[PDB]
Design a binder for this molecule. Structure first.
Ligand SMILES: [Cl-]
Ligand SMILES: [Mg+2]
Ligand SMILES: [Mg+2]
Lengths: 35, 33
């Protein structure tokens, strides 16, 4: 799984891809339906 | 994506899917370490 694939799959912005594990976790939370 | 699709995409173990955001972050880190 590449960084580019993650960006596309989770719709990440240019700023969000600077913090992939954290902005993984957040788009994880929105996965579980809590946000 | 469903939680099951996340398990498939990331290859998450039985235990790991119980903590999806955190075990999300860790398989995030493993991009390159
Ligand atoms: Cl599925
Ligand atoms: Mg970081
Ligand atoms: Mg569950």
């Amino acid at each position: 799984l590449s960084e580019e694939e993650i960006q596309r799959i989770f719709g990440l912005s240019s700023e969000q891809i600077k913090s992939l594990p954290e902005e993984x976790y957040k788009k994880x939370v929105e996965x579980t339906g809590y946000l």
